[PDB]
Structures are given as structure tokens and as C-alpha cells.
Amino acid sequence: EWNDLMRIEGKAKPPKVKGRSQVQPKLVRRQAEWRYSALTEPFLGSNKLFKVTPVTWEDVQGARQNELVLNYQFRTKLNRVSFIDNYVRSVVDDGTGIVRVGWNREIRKEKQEVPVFSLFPIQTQEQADALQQALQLRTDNPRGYEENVDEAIKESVRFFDETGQATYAVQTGTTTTEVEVPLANHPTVEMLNPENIIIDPSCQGDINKAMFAIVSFETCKADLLKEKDRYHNLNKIDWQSSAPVNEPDHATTTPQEFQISDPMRKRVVAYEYWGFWDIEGNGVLEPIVATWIGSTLIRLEKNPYPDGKLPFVLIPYMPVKRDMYGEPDAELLGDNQAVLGAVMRGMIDLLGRSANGQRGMPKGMLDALNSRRYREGEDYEYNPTQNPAQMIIEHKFPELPQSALTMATLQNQEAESLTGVKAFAGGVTGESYGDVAAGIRGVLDAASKREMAILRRLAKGMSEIGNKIIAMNAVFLAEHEVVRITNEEFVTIKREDLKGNFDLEVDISTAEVDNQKSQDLGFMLQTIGPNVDQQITLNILAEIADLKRMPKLAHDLRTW
Amino acid sequence: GQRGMPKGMLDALNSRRYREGEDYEYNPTQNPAQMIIEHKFPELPQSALTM
Amino acid sequence: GDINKAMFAIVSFETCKADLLKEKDRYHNLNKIDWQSSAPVNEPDHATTTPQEFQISDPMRKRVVAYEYWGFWDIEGNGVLEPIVATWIGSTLIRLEKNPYPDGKLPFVLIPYMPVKRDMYGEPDAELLGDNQAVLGAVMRGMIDLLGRSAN
Amino acid sequence: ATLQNQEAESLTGVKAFAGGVTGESYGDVAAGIRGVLDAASKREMAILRRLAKGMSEIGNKIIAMNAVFLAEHEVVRITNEEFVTIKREDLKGNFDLEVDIS
Amino acid sequence: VTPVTWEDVQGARQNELVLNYQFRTKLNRVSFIDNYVRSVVDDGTGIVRVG
Amino acid sequence: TAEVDNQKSQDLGFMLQTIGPNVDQQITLNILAEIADLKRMPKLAHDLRTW
Amino acid sequence: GDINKAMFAIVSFETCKADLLKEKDRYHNLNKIDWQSSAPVNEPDHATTTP
Amino acid sequence: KLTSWKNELSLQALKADLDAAKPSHTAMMIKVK
């Protein structure tokens, strides 16, 4: 009903009349139209989307590493602008937004020739110097070590890492070995159609208290074959039986008649069950996942993600107390839209149905010749009894009553009062999102704070998504990938500490936050004596340089 | 949007010509400018807005 | 609603024999092509500004419509999809090979003016303004008719 | 006529002789910090960012293609500096670079 | 083009120089920009082919 | 609230200005520690405290 | 009129067997309970959004 | 056979895919027109 009100469909459409208009102005569309651009801007003002801050003094390296990895992943693997637009539009239009977070992995086996090296004891000072230079290069610059050191010295360094004794290796022969090259290792974030996902109704208004959640999506055989070990009973599946046209419950934009010729690439609907079950029957509930296509159960296993919660995030546009869902603005504005449309139709019918351009002539004022002369457009002579100035009538549009304009203005004012959105005012709440930047001594009009609250509600969901993705990256990503992305030493996170989010805090980053942090750092540097300690000054300067996006200068200052 | 026309002002042919949307001729006894009425919305009283 | 999730993309363009001969190794079966059969006028589907009756005398410089297929196919039949490219003119397949570009994605970029949630395409401003334009035109026509039809 | 014009301007958000200065404020450190613009400017800014995203994608694709197709001597001629080599394995994932409109 | 890490300055400068030279020499930037913006505004969606 | 932290920072700065910087190093280091803490700089505060 | 001076307070909530079994020591006589007899539909006094 | 691949697409598959995808594009183009 809300979508029909938004798009003027269903009951919202005016009745069809042969001799009258069928026009309706779009009020809810307009109010949401400024809201979209009001909300979307804060999330796209800077190149960096996520900000990670340490909780203690020991967490700085981990926070920097996780921030770099998360920013790289969001910049490369996802289209940020489209995702933000879809997220904001769904939240505004439906009142509730469900986000699905998952992991995508694909590995290909390849065979490459690998040289065989035979160890030999280190002799003379030249070998020791070469090994020391290789170790120093690895410590200072991983990329230079990977590109320039060459394979034999790399093998020597690996043996030094494994065994304390230094050794020298000489190539003997080449042997073919099987190596796995992963094409894609990146998280996936996707908005979900509300009709697709079904949540436990007995959750008592809290998503975490929900026992189970079921989501239906479109998939092909290639996606299932990407991870062969994960799925079973693939041969028993009949692809024709499970089709988008066959299941009316699934809501999708795919045409009903579209079918790909290749059986491997054909799309079939599948279901998943995320919830808690008593697997051992002793009264202990643990998270599980189950996937079935049609009537065949293909996948059954425990929850793979470390967090142990359902990978869904809900964000309400307008919260309802002790309720999970939210409400849009169409509920308050449907009546006003209907009344405004009725008034506008009345005015347009009034103008259209009237006769315009016609001319009325009294009988007997002009005889045949004079009437013809008047019609052609030349001078004429009339009977003095009738006065052409008054008797000749040229029709015009009727005058509009003031009641229609007054009522249209009243409906518009009531709509703006209820919604809190004006045509050409507001929208600048995003510049004041930063706490240190503008929260301190920041005065905004009454209309800005509602948008501020909505922005905070969206930012909470964004922070939850970031935390989930960080938790997944802590396990799935390997050491060499993180070293390649960050070009720094790796920091390890213990598996038992993964359940509880310590040492980290995730929040949306804005341009003004960085400027205010730079000003605070400058003030702190001014307050402390420059000659008190050189290390503190160098670290402060490096922190200031980082916020200004000069990494070479910051690295030079740090290692000075 | 309704239109009311007095009886006898226009004969059959002139009435049809008026209805189609072309020029016509009327009897001088009655004046179409005042006789032809196009109904409109009534004016809202000030009492409702004041209250 | 995601361009990256698309399995395939097909684009039609106008080309001449010289362009194909620029890279002889890439294309095959050039002799079997009948140039007259494949023409912009012959195919109503292709949309172009070229005049229907315009024709270049030189056979080498004559323009013919061609099609390309950018998508993922299971080349080895073991369930692994890899990007490919295929070009055909008329009913003859001239080129077939893997994706040359390092990125491995379809070389197309889509930008929407006004995004539609869970949809690829966008919308212009004419959708909202058509009725207003019609009403304004009607009012202006009424005013001009009122002035013009009067005797002055 | 005035009502139709006002409704069209409200729906579209574009006026006759106002606005259009959003592009000068696109710079992040330039004007995004402590930059206040009217409500009508932010829609144009959003559309401009949507265009800039496609421009960045085009630039990334062209850089990826230049990484393979262009030879060493051509790049040396263009830049008049020493050549820097990029490995073929790193071509799939865009590391070390970020492209944006200047 | 901006570096992500401290080692990327030379590569960023090289790629920026090459890209700017190519776009300045091999293309008519003004006409391309006008066509791009006009098509995006008029049709609501713009498709760019890179080769 | 955010403004409470700012006002506490201003009060600490005023107290640091009023008291002689050289009368006691421990008091100055401590005051700098709470000033850094209110600015969300745990590492700087820890460095100042254990200096 | 004072909450602290209140002698008793009674609250009704919805729970499952797993919640009670989380801490087995606290609860007794779990077997004697019949789950069907005590249901949200059975008790009109309890107000909840559960269907 | 243009290529040495074990499974080759052939022109009929591409033509069938184009014919299948055509109806949606044809309906969409009406809005742009």
C-alpha cells in the first residue's frame, strides 16, 4: 500500500471519466525526493568510508590495519555509490532495510614448474652479508623483498625462519607441483527484498532474540559447484521443477519467459534456514545453516561465521515502540495527497470544460452584407438599436475561486508540518555529523534534528556491517594478502577473542572529522613543549600527515 | 464543472453549433454572458480558519 | 539489478573490411562474408544516423553491421565459467577467443541519472513533468486562440 | 501557469536563474570541510558524484589496459623518467592506486 | 591518481602522466564530456564502451 | 555529552595556565594526560603518564 | 507514591525451556510443567505482539 | 572449428540467447522513446 501511494497505483489512481481529468500531484514522492539527497550525501563526502579507532594504547596497529583492509575492500570489490543509493532509497521507501552479509571464495588449481634447491652450509662472509641484507629488506620493505630478492635467497630465508642455522641453496632441477590460485576472496553485501526474507514473529521486537530466519535467492549450478565440498545431492535436483515462474512466492525482476540455454548457467530458486537448533538433543541450542532446493536438502552444517549471529541487519526509518519494523511517511500523507489531487482535478475540469474562443452574435444587428463584411474583417455598419460593444460576446476562462487555492495551501502546510520537510530548506545535517567537529557548540534548527536521528540510525547499521565484515576478514583472509594490501607487518587476532569485539570501534568517517582531529592534534602539540620529547612530536606530526593523505611524509617522519 | 443554459435562448442548430465549439447566434432578448452559468467551488468562511 | 552479475552482453556496431584487416590474425573466414547481405538498411534492428541510401563505392571502405558477444561460458565443460568474446557478421562466425583485457569484466559502464532501487536503469525528469507540460501548453494555446480569434 | 511552473520546479528541484555552483565545492578538503550549501545543491552534487564514479571506473579500466599493452619505450618517451614495472598477478586486484577527478 | 602506500608515489605519477597525455592527445575531451552528460540526462542511463 | 568534554578541556587548560609549569613536572604530566584522554588519544596519554 | 516503599512487584514474561535449562540449579520441578496449558493464547492477561 | 576448446559455443547458442534477451530490451526501449 505504501509503494502504491508512492507510485500512484492501485487505490491511489483517480477514477477514469471520459469528460474529466485524471491528474494527481505527487506529494509523498516529493517529500521523499528531498529526503534521499538529504541522507545520501554524508556517506559519500570522502574517499574513506569507514573509520577505525583504538580503544587502548596497544590497539593502534590493529586499528590501522583493519581500516586499510576494509577501505580497500569497499573501494575495490563494491560499487559504493550504487549501494548507498539503494540502501537509502529502500530505507526511506519501505521503512525497514534488511542487509545480507556473506563471503565469496573461488579457487582454481594450476600446475607450474617449481625449481628444486639443495641446501649447503653458509661459507665466507659474503653469504652472511647477503642473508643479512635480505632479512633487512624483508623487514623494511616486503614488496621489494618479493620483487627483487629472487627465489634462491627467499628459500634460504625461509629455511632460516624454520631452522635457526643459516644455509645456502643451489638450484638442481624443476618439478611440477599443484598450486591453488584464488580468483576472488572478498565479502559480499546485498540489499534484500522484504518479501523474500521471513523472520521469526515471536522475536518480541528484537532481531537478536529471533529463533530463525529464512531467505530465498536466485542461484545457478556454477555457484554451487564453486564449492563442491559444501553441497551434496546435486544430481537429484531437477532444475525445471524449481523455477522463478514455478514459485509465485519469490519476488524478482527477472522476466517469467526468460531462460538461459546453457543448463549450467540457468537460474533456480533456493532457500536457506539460519537459526538455532538442539543438535545433540540435550537442551543446548547452537547456530546452524540449512539449504534446500525444491524438496531436496543439499547443505547442512554449523554456522561458519565467527560472530555466531544471523547475517542480517535491520534499520527502521521511523521506529515503533516494542516493534521490529518501521513506518514511512506515506501513512500520514495519503489523505493530504488525495485531497490535493481532488482539488487540482476540480480546477482543471473547471478550466477545461468551459468554452473559449467562441463568439456570440445577436440576431438582427447586422444584415447579410454587413455580417459578411464583419466576418471577413473590414468595416461595417450596424443598427443603432443594438450596441455591438455589449451584445457581441467573446467567451473566456472562468475565474478560479479562492477556496481551491486556500485548501491546497492548507494541505501542503499540514503535510510539511507532519513530515517536517520543506521544499528548499534544510539538508545540511550531514556536515554536522562529526562529534568533535560540530557536535560541540553546534546549534541547528528544530527540523535538522529529525534528519540527524535518521542519519544516526543509518550509521548504526553501517557500523554493524563493518564490524561483521571485520570479524569475517579476521578469519578468512590470509597473512600474505593483508601484507600485500597494507605493506606492513601482520598482526594476529586470537580466535577466542573473536566472539567479543574488543580493541576496536567502527564509525563512519567524514571530511570535517579529519580536519577537527588535525586541529586537536595541533593544539595538543602546541600545549606540550616541543623540546620535551622528540618521539612524541614525531608521532604527532605523522598522525597529522596521515589525516592529510600524505603517506610518504608520515612514513618518513615515523622512521626518522 | 456543470453548465446551465436557459430555455429558448438558442434554437436547435445554434445550440448544436455552440455545443460542438463554433460560433453561434443567440436571441437578443437573453444575454448569454449572464444567463450561461458555470458552477464553481463555494467560498470558504473565515470562521473555520479562525477557529 | 547488478551489471557485474550479468552473464552476457551483446553490442552491435558498424565496421568496414579495413578495420578487420588491421588485425588479420584475430579474424577468420573473411572471404565467406557476403558484404551486401549485411547492411544497415538490411537490418532494421540496428539504430544509426547513417542515411539508408548512402553507399560507398569502394568495397574496402564499405560499412557492414557486426555483432559481439561478451560473456562467461564453460569452455572445457567441467563446470568452470570463464570470460570469452565472439564476433559474427550475418550468419558467419569470424572471431572466437578469450577475454583479452586483464580486468576480466565486460567493458561496459552504466551510470543512472535517478536510480531505481534494485534496478539497473535510471529515470529522467520527463516522467514527472509530462502532465505539467501538457497543461501549460493547453493554457498557452487557449490564451493565444483568445487573442487571435478576436477582431482588432 | 504559475502553479504548473511552481509544481515542476518543486518536483525537479531546478530553478531558472539559481544554482549550478555545486561543482566548485566538489573538492573534499577544498570545500567539503565546513561547507554549507542550500538544499537544491545536494541533489546536483549526488548526480555529479554518480557521474564521477563512472569516470573513475573508466580511468581504472584504461590504466589496467595500459599496464599491459603499452611498452617501456613509449612510457619513457611520455614521462622522461625511469620505468616502473607492475606484475601480471597484481593486475586483477587494483592495489597501490586510487583514481579520482581532479 | 594518488598513492595508497608510501612506495606507490612513482607509479601514481607515471600513470597520471600517461593517462593525462592520452586523454589530451587521442581524444576530444569537450565533445566526449558533452555527449556523456547529455545522454545521461536525456535517457537516464549511459553506457560507455572501452577498447 | 560532547560539550562537557570540551569544557573540561578548557578548564584543565585554564588550571595549567594558572599554575606555574615549572613548579612540578608530575602535575603537568598528569594534567596533560587527562587533556589527551578527553581528546580520544589513548597512546599519547599513556606516553605522557609513563614518561 | 514511592517505588522504593513498594512491598512487592510482579512481572510476566515469555520464556522457553532452553532459557530455564541454561541455569539448571536455579529451577526445579521442570518436568511437572505442561507447556500446552501455559501459552500466550491461553492467558488473555499477558499483552504481546506474538501471533 | 575456430578454437581447440573441448566445448564450443557455436552460433546457434548466441542467437538463441539474443532472441531470449530481446523481449525485455524491446519493452524497455518504449520508455526511452
mmCIF file of N, CA, C and O in Angstrom, chain C residues 45-103:
data_model
loop_
_atom_site.group_PDB
_atom_site.id
_atom_site.type_symbol
_atom_site.label_atom_id
_atom_site.label_comp_id
_atom_site.label_asym_id
_atom_site.label_seq_id
_atom_site.Cartn_x
_atom_site.Cartn_y
_atom_site.Cartn_z
ATOM 1 N N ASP C 45 16.971 -3.555 -36.972
ATOM 2 C CA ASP C 45 17.223 -3.520 -35.534
ATOM 3 C C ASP C 45 18.307 -2.512 -35.178
ATOM 4 O O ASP C 45 18.192 -1.797 -34.176
ATOM 5 N N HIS C 46 19.369 -2.445 -35.978
ATOM 6 C CA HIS C 46 20.448 -1.508 -35.699
ATOM 7 C C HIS C 46 19.965 -0.075 -35.881
ATOM 8 O O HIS C 46 19.325 0.263 -36.880
ATOM 9 N N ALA C 47 20.276 0.772 -34.903
ATOM 10 C CA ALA C 47 19.876 2.173 -34.910
ATOM 11 C C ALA C 47 21.105 3.035 -35.164
ATOM 12 O O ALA C 47 22.067 2.993 -34.390
ATOM 13 N N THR C 48 21.067 3.817 -36.240
ATOM 14 C CA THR C 48 22.191 4.653 -36.627
ATOM 15 C C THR C 48 21.679 5.881 -37.366
ATOM 16 O O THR C 48 20.538 5.921 -37.833
ATOM 17 N N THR C 49 22.541 6.889 -37.460
ATOM 18 C CA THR C 49 22.230 8.119 -38.176
ATOM 19 C C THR C 49 22.645 8.070 -39.641
ATOM 20 O O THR C 49 22.418 9.044 -40.367
ATOM 21 N N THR C 50 23.248 6.973 -40.086
ATOM 22 C CA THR C 50 23.670 6.864 -41.473
ATOM 23 C C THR C 50 22.452 6.853 -42.393
ATOM 24 O O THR C 50 21.475 6.143 -42.122
ATOM 25 N N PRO C 51 22.464 7.634 -43.474
ATOM 26 C CA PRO C 51 21.348 7.593 -44.426
ATOM 27 C C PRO C 51 21.185 6.206 -45.030
ATOM 28 O O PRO C 51 22.162 5.488 -45.258
ATOM 29 N N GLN C 52 19.929 5.832 -45.282
ATOM 30 C CA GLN C 52 19.641 4.499 -45.802
ATOM 31 C C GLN C 52 20.224 4.303 -47.196
ATOM 32 O O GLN C 52 20.769 3.237 -47.504
ATOM 33 N N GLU C 53 20.121 5.318 -48.052
ATOM 34 C CA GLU C 53 20.548 5.197 -49.439
ATOM 35 C C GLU C 53 22.019 5.533 -49.654
ATOM 36 O O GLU C 53 22.516 5.366 -50.773
ATOM 37 N N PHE C 54 22.722 6.003 -48.626
ATOM 38 C CA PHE C 54 24.140 6.304 -48.771
ATOM 39 C C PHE C 54 24.936 5.014 -48.917
ATOM 40 O O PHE C 54 24.694 4.038 -48.201
ATOM 41 N N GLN C 55 25.892 5.011 -49.846
ATOM 42 C CA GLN C 55 26.699 3.827 -50.105
ATOM 43 C C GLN C 55 28.055 4.242 -50.657
ATOM 44 O O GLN C 55 28.127 5.041 -51.595
ATOM 45 N N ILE C 56 29.124 3.693 -50.076
ATOM 46 C CA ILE C 56 30.470 3.983 -50.552
ATOM 47 C C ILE C 56 30.821 3.044 -51.698
ATOM 48 O O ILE C 56 30.580 1.831 -51.630
ATOM 49 N N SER C 57 31.389 3.608 -52.769
ATOM 50 C CA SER C 57 31.706 2.813 -53.952
ATOM 51 C C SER C 57 32.777 1.768 -53.663
ATOM 52 O O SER C 57 32.662 0.615 -54.096
ATOM 53 N N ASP C 58 33.827 2.149 -52.940
ATOM 54 C CA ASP C 58 34.952 1.247 -52.740
ATOM 55 C C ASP C 58 34.547 0.080 -51.841
ATOM 56 O O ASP C 58 34.034 0.291 -50.738
ATOM 57 N N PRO C 59 34.753 -1.163 -52.290
ATOM 58 C CA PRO C 59 34.401 -2.316 -51.443
ATOM 59 C C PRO C 59 35.164 -2.364 -50.130
ATOM 60 O O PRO C 59 34.620 -2.824 -49.118
ATOM 61 N N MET C 60 36.419 -1.909 -50.119
ATOM 62 C CA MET C 60 37.223 -1.982 -48.903
ATOM 63 C C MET C 60 36.687 -1.050 -47.825
ATOM 64 O O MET C 60 36.769 -1.359 -46.630
ATOM 65 N N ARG C 61 36.139 0.094 -48.223
ATOM 66 C CA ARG C 61 35.673 1.105 -47.285
ATOM 67 C C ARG C 61 34.186 0.997 -46.973
ATOM 68 O O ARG C 61 33.653 1.863 -46.270
ATOM 69 N N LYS C 62 33.504 -0.029 -47.474
ATOM 70 C CA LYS C 62 32.078 -0.167 -47.223
ATOM 71 C C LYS C 62 31.830 -0.643 -45.795
ATOM 72 O O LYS C 62 32.573 -1.464 -45.251
ATOM 73 N N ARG C 63 30.769 -0.119 -45.189
ATOM 74 C CA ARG C 63 30.450 -0.377 -43.790
ATOM 75 C C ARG C 63 29.420 -1.495 -43.685
ATOM 76 O O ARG C 63 28.409 -1.484 -44.396
ATOM 77 N N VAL C 64 29.680 -2.453 -42.798
ATOM 78 C CA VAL C 64 28.786 -3.580 -42.559
ATOM 79 C C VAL C 64 28.543 -3.700 -41.061
ATOM 80 O O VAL C 64 29.427 -3.395 -40.252
ATOM 81 N N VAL C 65 27.339 -4.137 -40.692
ATOM 82 C CA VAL C 65 26.989 -4.280 -39.284
ATOM 83 C C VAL C 65 27.545 -5.591 -38.745
ATOM 84 O O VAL C 65 27.499 -6.632 -39.414
ATOM 85 N N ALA C 66 28.074 -5.545 -37.524
ATOM 86 C CA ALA C 66 28.646 -6.718 -36.879
ATOM 87 C C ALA C 66 28.153 -6.791 -35.441
ATOM 88 O O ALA C 66 27.735 -5.790 -34.854
ATOM 89 N N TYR C 67 28.209 -7.996 -34.879
ATOM 90 C CA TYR C 67 27.758 -8.261 -33.520
ATOM 91 C C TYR C 67 28.893 -8.868 -32.710
ATOM 92 O O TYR C 67 29.737 -9.588 -33.251
ATOM 93 N N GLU C 68 28.908 -8.580 -31.409
ATOM 94 C CA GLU C 68 29.869 -9.167 -30.488
ATOM 95 C C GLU C 68 29.144 -9.717 -29.269
ATOM 96 O O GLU C 68 28.100 -9.195 -28.869
ATOM 97 N N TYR C 69 29.705 -10.774 -28.686
ATOM 98 C CA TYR C 69 29.129 -11.442 -27.526
ATOM 99 C C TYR C 69 30.176 -11.496 -26.422
ATOM 100 O O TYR C 69 31.145 -12.255 -26.520
ATOM 101 N N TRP C 70 29.977 -10.695 -25.380
ATOM 102 C CA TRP C 70 30.845 -10.683 -24.208
ATOM 103 C C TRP C 70 30.116 -11.382 -23.069
ATOM 104 O O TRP C 70 29.058 -10.918 -22.631
ATOM 105 N N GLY C 71 30.679 -12.488 -22.589
ATOM 106 C CA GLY C 71 30.021 -13.245 -21.544
ATOM 107 C C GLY C 71 30.899 -14.360 -21.021
ATOM 108 O O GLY C 71 32.055 -14.515 -21.420
ATOM 109 N N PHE C 72 30.325 -15.140 -20.109
ATOM 110 C CA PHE C 72 31.009 -16.249 -19.457
ATOM 111 C C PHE C 72 30.465 -17.565 -19.994
ATOM 112 O O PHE C 72 29.247 -17.751 -20.073
ATOM 113 N N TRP C 73 31.368 -18.472 -20.362
ATOM 114 C CA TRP C 73 30.989 -19.767 -20.907
ATOM 115 C C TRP C 73 31.860 -20.853 -20.294
ATOM 116 O O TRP C 73 33.000 -20.607 -19.894
ATOM 117 N N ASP C 74 31.305 -22.063 -20.225
ATOM 118 C CA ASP C 74 32.038 -23.240 -19.759
ATOM 119 C C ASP C 74 32.740 -23.847 -20.966
ATOM 120 O O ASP C 74 32.188 -24.688 -21.677
ATOM 121 N N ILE C 75 33.979 -23.413 -21.201
ATOM 122 C CA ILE C 75 34.691 -23.816 -22.411
ATOM 123 C C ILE C 75 35.077 -25.290 -22.349
ATOM 124 O O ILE C 75 34.962 -26.017 -23.344
ATOM 125 N N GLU C 76 35.541 -25.755 -21.192
ATOM 126 C CA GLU C 76 36.012 -27.126 -21.050
ATOM 127 C C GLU C 76 34.936 -28.084 -20.553
ATOM 128 O O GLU C 76 35.190 -29.290 -20.479
ATOM 129 N N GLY C 77 33.752 -27.582 -20.209
ATOM 130 C CA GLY C 77 32.638 -28.441 -19.858
ATOM 131 C C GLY C 77 32.692 -29.070 -18.485
ATOM 132 O O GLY C 77 31.901 -29.981 -18.213
ATOM 133 N N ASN C 78 33.590 -28.624 -17.609
ATOM 134 C CA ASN C 78 33.710 -29.200 -16.276
ATOM 135 C C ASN C 78 33.008 -28.377 -15.205
ATOM 136 O O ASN C 78 33.180 -28.661 -14.016
ATOM 137 N N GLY C 79 32.225 -27.372 -15.590
ATOM 138 C CA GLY C 79 31.537 -26.542 -14.624
ATOM 139 C C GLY C 79 32.244 -25.258 -14.257
ATOM 140 O O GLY C 79 31.865 -24.623 -13.267
ATOM 141 N N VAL C 80 33.260 -24.860 -15.015
ATOM 142 C CA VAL C 80 34.021 -23.647 -14.745
ATOM 143 C C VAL C 80 33.711 -22.631 -15.834
ATOM 144 O O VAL C 80 33.897 -22.909 -17.025
ATOM 145 N N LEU C 81 33.248 -21.452 -15.429
ATOM 146 C CA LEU C 81 32.897 -20.391 -16.363
ATOM 147 C C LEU C 81 34.041 -19.392 -16.472
ATOM 148 O O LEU C 81 34.562 -18.922 -15.456
ATOM 149 N N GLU C 82 34.423 -19.065 -17.706
ATOM 150 C CA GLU C 82 35.469 -18.090 -17.963
ATOM 151 C C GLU C 82 35.000 -17.088 -19.010
ATOM 152 O O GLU C 82 34.191 -17.433 -19.880
ATOM 153 N N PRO C 83 35.481 -15.846 -18.952
ATOM 154 C CA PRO C 83 35.038 -14.841 -19.927
ATOM 155 C C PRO C 83 35.527 -15.168 -21.330
ATOM 156 O O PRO C 83 36.622 -15.699 -21.521
ATOM 157 N N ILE C 84 34.695 -14.837 -22.322
ATOM 158 C CA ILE C 84 35.001 -15.086 -23.726
ATOM 159 C C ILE C 84 34.517 -13.901 -24.549
ATOM 160 O O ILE C 84 33.816 -13.017 -24.054
ATOM 161 N N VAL C 85 34.900 -13.892 -25.825
ATOM 162 C CA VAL C 85 34.416 -12.916 -26.795
ATOM 163 C C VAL C 85 34.161 -13.641 -28.111
ATOM 164 O O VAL C 85 34.943 -14.512 -28.507
ATOM 165 N N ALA C 86 33.055 -13.301 -28.771
ATOM 166 C CA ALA C 86 32.687 -13.900 -30.047
ATOM 167 C C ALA C 86 32.107 -12.828 -30.955
ATOM 168 O O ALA C 86 31.243 -12.054 -30.531
ATOM 169 N N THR C 87 32.575 -12.789 -32.200
ATOM 170 C CA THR C 87 32.133 -11.812 -33.186
ATOM 171 C C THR C 87 31.641 -12.540 -34.427
ATOM 172 O O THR C 87 32.328 -13.429 -34.940
ATOM 173 N N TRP C 88 30.456 -12.166 -34.907
ATOM 174 C CA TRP C 88 29.888 -12.759 -36.109
ATOM 175 C C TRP C 88 29.267 -11.676 -36.976
ATOM 176 O O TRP C 88 28.706 -10.702 -36.464
ATOM 177 N N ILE C 89 29.373 -11.849 -38.291
ATOM 178 C CA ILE C 89 28.748 -10.966 -39.267
ATOM 179 C C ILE C 89 27.747 -11.783 -40.069
ATOM 180 O O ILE C 89 28.115 -12.792 -40.684
ATOM 181 N N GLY C 90 26.492 -11.348 -40.068
ATOM 182 C CA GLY C 90 25.462 -12.106 -40.756
ATOM 183 C C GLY C 90 25.225 -13.434 -40.068
ATOM 184 O O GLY C 90 24.731 -13.497 -38.938
ATOM 185 N N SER C 91 25.579 -14.518 -40.757
ATOM 186 C CA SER C 91 25.466 -15.865 -40.216
ATOM 187 C C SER C 91 26.808 -16.581 -40.134
ATOM 188 O O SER C 91 26.837 -17.806 -39.988
ATOM 189 N N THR C 92 27.915 -15.849 -40.226
ATOM 190 C CA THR C 92 29.252 -16.428 -40.203
ATOM 191 C C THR C 92 29.996 -15.945 -38.965
ATOM 192 O O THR C 92 30.014 -14.744 -38.676
ATOM 193 N N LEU C 93 30.612 -16.881 -38.244
ATOM 194 C CA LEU C 93 31.385 -16.567 -37.043
ATOM 195 C C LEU C 93 32.829 -16.321 -37.463
ATOM 196 O O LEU C 93 33.484 -17.202 -38.025
ATOM 197 N N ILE C 94 33.333 -15.115 -37.189
ATOM 198 C CA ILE C 94 34.648 -14.737 -37.696
ATOM 199 C C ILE C 94 35.703 -14.808 -36.598
ATOM 200 O O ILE C 94 36.870 -15.122 -36.864
ATOM 201 N N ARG C 95 35.323 -14.522 -35.355
ATOM 202 C CA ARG C 95 36.285 -14.410 -34.265
ATOM 203 C C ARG C 95 35.761 -15.135 -33.036
ATOM 204 O O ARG C 95 34.577 -15.025 -32.702
ATOM 205 N N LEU C 96 36.645 -15.875 -32.370
ATOM 206 C CA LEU C 96 36.305 -16.601 -31.151
ATOM 207 C C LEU C 96 37.567 -16.793 -30.328
ATOM 208 O O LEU C 96 38.494 -17.482 -30.767
ATOM 209 N N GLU C 97 37.602 -16.195 -29.140
ATOM 210 C CA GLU C 97 38.757 -16.302 -28.259
ATOM 211 C C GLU C 97 38.349 -15.866 -26.859
ATOM 212 O O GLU C 97 37.193 -15.521 -26.605
ATOM 213 N N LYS C 98 39.322 -15.889 -25.951
ATOM 214 C CA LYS C 98 39.084 -15.487 -24.574
ATOM 215 C C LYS C 98 39.097 -13.965 -24.444
ATOM 216 O O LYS C 98 39.370 -13.232 -25.398
ATOM 217 N N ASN C 99 38.794 -13.497 -23.239
ATOM 218 C CA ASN C 99 38.778 -12.065 -22.981
ATOM 219 C C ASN C 99 40.205 -11.525 -22.976
ATOM 220 O O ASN C 99 41.037 -11.989 -22.183
ATOM 221 N N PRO C 100 40.531 -10.554 -23.835
ATOM 222 C CA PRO C 100 41.921 -10.071 -23.880
ATOM 223 C C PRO C 100 42.273 -9.129 -22.744
ATOM 224 O O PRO C 100 43.429 -9.111 -22.302
ATOM 225 N N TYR C 101 41.316 -8.342 -22.259
ATOM 226 C CA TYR C 101 41.621 -7.323 -21.269
ATOM 227 C C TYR C 101 41.944 -7.953 -19.913
ATOM 228 O O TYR C 101 41.318 -8.937 -19.509
ATOM 229 N N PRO C 102 42.928 -7.401 -19.196
ATOM 230 C CA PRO C 102 43.356 -8.024 -17.930
ATOM 231 C C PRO C 102 42.285 -8.043 -16.853
ATOM 232 O O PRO C 102 42.286 -8.948 -16.008
ATOM 233 N N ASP C 103 41.377 -7.064 -16.847
ATOM 234 C CA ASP C 103 40.409 -6.962 -15.758
ATOM 235 C C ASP C 103 39.480 -8.169 -15.719
ATOM 236 O O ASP C 103 39.061 -8.603 -14.640
#
